[PDB]
Design a protein around this nucleic acid. Structure first.
Ligand SMILES: [Mg+2]
Ligand SMILES: [Mg+2]
Ligand SMILES: [Mg+2]
Ligand SMILES: [Mg+2]
Ligand SMILES: [Mg+2]
Ligand SMILES: [Mg+2]
Ligand SMILES: [Mg+2]
Ligand SMILES: [Mg+2]
Ligand SMILES: [Mg+2]
Ligand SMILES: [Mg+2]
Ligand SMILES: [Mg+2]
Ligand SMILES: [Mg+2]
Ligand SMILES: [Mg+2]
Ligand SMILES: [Mg+2]
Ligand SMILES: [Mg+2]
Ligand SMILES: [Mg+2]
Ligand SMILES: [Mg+2]
Ligand SMILES: [Mg+2]
Ligand SMILES: [Mg+2]
Ligand SMILES: [Mg+2]
Ligand SMILES: [Mg+2]
Ligand SMILES: [Mg+2]
Ligand SMILES: [Mg+2]
Ligand SMILES: [Mg+2]
Ligand SMILES: [Mg+2]
Ligand SMILES: [Mg+2]
Ligand SMILES: [Mg+2]
Ligand SMILES: [Mg+2]
Ligand SMILES: [Mg+2]
Ligand SMILES: [Mg+2]
Ligand SMILES: [Zn+2]
Lengths: 45, 108, 152, 48
RNA sequence: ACCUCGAUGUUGGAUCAGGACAUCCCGAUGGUGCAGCCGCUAUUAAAGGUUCGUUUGUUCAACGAUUAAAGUCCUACGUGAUCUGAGUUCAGACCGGAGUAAUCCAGGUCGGUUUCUAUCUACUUUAAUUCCUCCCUGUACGAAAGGACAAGAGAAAUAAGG
RNA sequence: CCUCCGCAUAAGCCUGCGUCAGCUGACAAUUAACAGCCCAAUAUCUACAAUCAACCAACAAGUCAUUAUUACCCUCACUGUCAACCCAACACAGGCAUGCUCAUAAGGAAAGGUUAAAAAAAGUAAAAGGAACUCGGCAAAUCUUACCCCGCCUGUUUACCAAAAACAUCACCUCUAGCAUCACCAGUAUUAGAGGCACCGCCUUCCUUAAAUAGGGAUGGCUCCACGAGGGUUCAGCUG
RNA sequence: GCUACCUAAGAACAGCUAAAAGAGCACACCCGUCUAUGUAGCAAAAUAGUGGGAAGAUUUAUAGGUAGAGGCGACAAACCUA
């Protein structure tokens, strides 16, 4: 019954965890900054 | 139920090296007079049977070529003739399957 | 308990067993020699003999025709059964099939058997031949036979 | 006097001949169809 | 309050029962307010047996019909890695009551997940009993009414083995 | 022999059974018409559903329209196109929208071989009996009566132990508010919000069984018409 | 991207009976009453049968919204990525 909570859809993916949305607010800018400091290859989803 | 204690290697050896578990020696192996390869007394020689199966496969390929299509089983007997052979008097009125090789010695 | 039970339990049930035997028997009628698991060949040998008997019963017999129609999935074999196999064995009364064991199948090591209809055109199988009458034991037994014949 | 059954492929088997015979069954239904409407319906219903 | 709170709910029921005898029946005796039949009481006997139904979780109990009898117990109130979960035990919700309320209740009710593939021990083919009927015999006994033993025969039932 | 399916689109994934030679490396491939990717302004237009739209029927009132001027010669670019595929840690018996096929023309294989021990699961058949089983007719088989308790009813709920008598519910009742440019509301006391309760309507020892701890009957409160995988009782039939 | 509720604009609902129904029987579809299996399972909630609804307060695809001393909730202390 459970387990398949992920129903993929690129529109939702980009509108929820995209670069534009992360930069939209100061908090998301800090998210991107933390990823860059850690050296993440994928800064935004 | 789960095991209550690890079974020691001594007990495990006693169990898995028991004669009831050891592979039994076969004493019905013999040499095929025809080809000299090994066979069992009650089983057909593997080598000779492979010969027969291959020759049968060739004959059956010839039969399929002659029939030319599914559901074409003849209503008459079949006779296999090799190079240098001619239908005999009783071979008359029987479909002839021609083979390009000479008559095998074991075939008769 | 299976005292007196003479039919093997094969396939997915009774109908599936009948269909498996039917396919094996159709192949046997078509090719005059078939390799199959030993148990299935043993089960199908009786049906092969019974088909030969039904073919002997005659082409015009309605019951024999119906039995052949059921048991030969490929209908081109029915003329073969009624006009080749049955005339071939018209002289014989039984033992139309020769069944022998074959080395175990390489795939699953199953007990394999080759079953053929006697008198087919295919190359003869390496049949097991009894010891020659000229062996030491056979010659001694020949001496026994001659002495007994002369004495009595 | 000997009524040998017709030498045709089986209708339900998994083979090329059986598939051809099933196609023939479909075409026979098309032939038996009376109205041109029914003929066209049978001929075009299955979309591929 | 001595072992177990570092996965064993519990009561009944099913299944299989092992055991004690302080014996319910069947066996053998003594006494009797034992004439006989019924009984009462005590000694000995544990080989065998000791029913099925209605209500109700219910063991128990009441009731119905029987039985020769429908025994008292122990076995982790035997047995749930063999089963059931009907009461009872968590989360839900009602009636009654307590509480300002949250909530609560030895009460009543409706519902409510019962896992385990067996490593070790152990084990896995070891001369029947009883009821009824007839005969003895409606004989003994008795005034009568009632009514016996023992022995024999016939029928069954259960249990074991086929 | 089976067909739950199947073929496409969508979504998703991203080369993931094409060829070659040793799962690995190389090589190849999806070709736009289908689809996506649009629109020059300024004002100005637009009451009359859909339901075969015609009768008829409404209510919950509903998906489709331009004009008036001013501008305006370059036309076919780009991207998707494969697959045995996605979400479930898996070649997972699960989840997965739509159009056709309504059982197929498409797609598939339940049996590795043997034997036919126990125990276990599923299924079929059963002498006589027919609930005596059991907490309970659970399950199975048949196609079956009548009555109680609760809740009016359709619906909702503890996703993963409770689907109910609990929540909601039309109806009824209580309280609050005299008002506009972001909800209420582009509304205005026949309205809106908060809450209770629950439609409507009305007032003020005996029977059952042989046996019965079971069942039935002698402002609020009554009232079971209908309905219920709710909880009890039950005739008859049914059946391992 | 689950789920609770909502917003925009879409889609589905065979057949029969009755006629305009939060009607009846019953497909697809949704749900999950009871039983059995399963219990490291096919499955971190499934399978088979049985069953409730199935033109509506229905089911559902797409995008958006409400965020934790919060949301949402026909209150089950339900759900808000097992
Ligand atoms: Mg979804
Ligand atoms: Mg098998
Ligand atoms: Mg102390
Ligand atoms: Mg004693
Ligand atoms: Mg005690
Ligand atoms: Mg209970
Ligand atoms: Mg209580
Ligand atoms: Mg209860
Ligand atoms: Mg229930
Ligand atoms: Mg258990
Ligand atoms: Mg076990
Ligand atoms: Mg298979
Ligand atoms: Mg197997
Ligand atoms: Mg019966
Ligand atoms: Mg009855
Ligand atoms: Mg009982
Ligand atoms: Mg009973
Ligand atoms: Mg039932
Ligand atoms: Mg209700
Ligand atoms: Mg309902
Ligand atoms: Mg639940
Ligand atoms: Mg739900
Ligand atoms: Mg439930
Ligand atoms: Mg009862
Ligand atoms: Mg309909
Ligand atoms: Mg309806
Ligand atoms: Mg809701
Ligand atoms: Mg509550
Ligand atoms: Mg609570
Ligand atoms: Mg979570
Ligand atoms: Zn040889």
């Amino acid at each position: 019954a459970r387990g398949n909570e992920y129903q993929p859809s690129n529109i939702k993916r980009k509108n929820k965890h995209g670069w534009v949305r992360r930069l939209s607010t100061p908090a998301g800018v800090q998210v991107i900054l933390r990823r860059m400091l850690k050296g993440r290859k994928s800064l935004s989803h | 139920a789960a095991p209550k204690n690890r079974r020691t290697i001594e007990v495990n050896r006693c169990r898995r090296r028991n004669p009831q578990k050891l592979i039994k020696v076969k004493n019905n192996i013999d040499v095929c007079p025809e080809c000299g390869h090994l066979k069992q007394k009650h089983v057909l020689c593997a080598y000779c049977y492979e010969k027969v199966c291959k020759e049968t496969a060739e004959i059956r390929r010839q039969i399929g070529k002659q029939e030319g299509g599914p559901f074409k089983a003849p209503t008459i007997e079949t006779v296999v003739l090799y190079t240098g052979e001619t239908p005999s008097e009783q071979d008359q009125g029987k479909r002839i399957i021609e083979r390009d090789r000479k008559r095998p010695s074991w075939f008769t | 308990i299976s005292h007196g039970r003479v039919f093997r339990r094969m396939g997915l049930g009774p109908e599936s067993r009948i269909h498996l035997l039917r396919n094996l028997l159709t192949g046997l009628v078509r090719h005059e020699r078939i390799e199959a698991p030993w148990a299935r060949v043993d089960e199908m040998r009786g049906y092969a003999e019974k088909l030969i008997d039904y073919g002997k019963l005659g082409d015009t017999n309605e019951r024999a025709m119906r039995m052949a129609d059921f048991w030969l999935t490929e209908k081109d074999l029915i003329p073969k059964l009624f006009q080749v196999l049955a005339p071939r064995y018209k002289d014989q009364t039984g033992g139309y099939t020769r069944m022998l064991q074959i080395p175990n199948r390489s795939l699953d090591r199953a007990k394999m058997a080759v079953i053929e209809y006697k008198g087919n055109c295919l190359p003869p199988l390496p049949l097991p031949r009894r010891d020659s009458h000229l062996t030491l034991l056979n010659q001694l037994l020949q001496g026994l036979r001659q002495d007994l014949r002369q004495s009595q | 006097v000997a009524r040998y059954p017709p030498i045709v492929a089986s209708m339900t088997a998994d083979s090329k001949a059986a598939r051809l015979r099933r196609i023939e069954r479909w075409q026979a239904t098309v032939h038996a169809a009376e109205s041109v409407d029914e003929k066209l319906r049978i001929l075009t219903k299955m979309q591929f």
